[PDB]
Amino acid sequence: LIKENMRMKVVLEGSVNGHQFKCTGEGEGNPYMGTQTMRIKVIEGGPLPFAFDILATSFSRTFIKYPKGIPDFFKQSFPEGFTWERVTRYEDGGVITVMQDTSLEDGCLVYHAQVRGVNFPSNGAVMQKKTKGWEPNTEMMYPADGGLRGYTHMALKVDGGGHLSCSFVTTYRSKKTVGNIKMPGIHAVSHRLERLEESDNEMFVVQREHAVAKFAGLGGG
């Protein structure tokens, strides 16, 4: 079901500080190598009056490299797929809630994300488009009643060389209820998300991600 080269398509829509928009993306990657690239268009509501960086982490968990010794929750969830629900809090008060469905349709991964952001300061780096991409990070993953909870502290680079911190907790839930998933233990996922291309107003973006699971040291228990 999950081949060495897999394509994905995504619809992402919602609002940030009351501004409605819709984006569509399509890409491909190597799910067992933890690599993927996506080409994204803002098709409604552009140009967005906020940094695209705040959406970039909402566009793919099937594409994580898992070593022997750590079961891959996401790959095992197919054909039914899985969902994820996330609340992201930024240090300047911005809050983004995202609900995402992941499905496998005609051999393609198909994502739908609904996003609602509020409370971003009007003259902050996000709403003034003064961001410069995400620093690499490590997400902790914990088993929780047959799903996973992911916990992340991320740093968004800003003009002036500072960072805006954010944290989030993601609930990952499998839609497979025929067949069982072999649950992992506590582990960590290292991510690096890079912007490859962008147009002037960010209405076209290409981004690539590398994600590799690892054991979590003392925090692994």
Three-class DSSP labels, 52-113: CHHHHCCCCCCCCECCCCCCCHHHHCCCCCEEEEEEEEECCCCEEEEEEEEEEECCEEEEEE
Structure tokens at 73: 């929750």
d(CA 66, CA 84): 19
> Technique behind this structure?
X-ray
Return the half-sphere exposure (C-beta side, CA atoms, 13 A cut-off) of residue 63. Answer: 24
- Residue 219's SS3 state is helix
- Residue 179's SS3 state is coil
Best CA proximity match to 40, nearest among 9, 84, 17, 5:
9
Best CA proximity match to 11, nearest among 33, 41, 51:
41
Phi, psi at residue 103, to the nearest 5°? Answer: -135, 160
d(CA 201, CA 184): 41
Domains of the chain: total: 1
Beta carbons within 10 angstroms of residue 16's beta carbon: 24
Q: Read off the CATH number of the domain in which 202 is found.
A: 2.40.155.10
Structure tokens at 150: 């992911």
Cis amide linkage into residue 184, ω under 30° from 0: no
Mode of pairing for the β-strands spanning 6-16 and 108-118: parallel
Instruction: Name beta bridge partners: 90.
Output: 166
Domain of residue 129, residue span: 1-221
Three-class DSSP labels, 6-64: EEEEEEEEEEECCEEEEEEEEEEEECCCCEEEEEEEEEECCCCCCCCHHHHCCCCCCCC
Q: What is the resolution of this structure in A?
A: 1.6
Phi, psi at residue 23, to the nearest 5°? Answer: -125, 150
d(CA 163, CA 212): 24
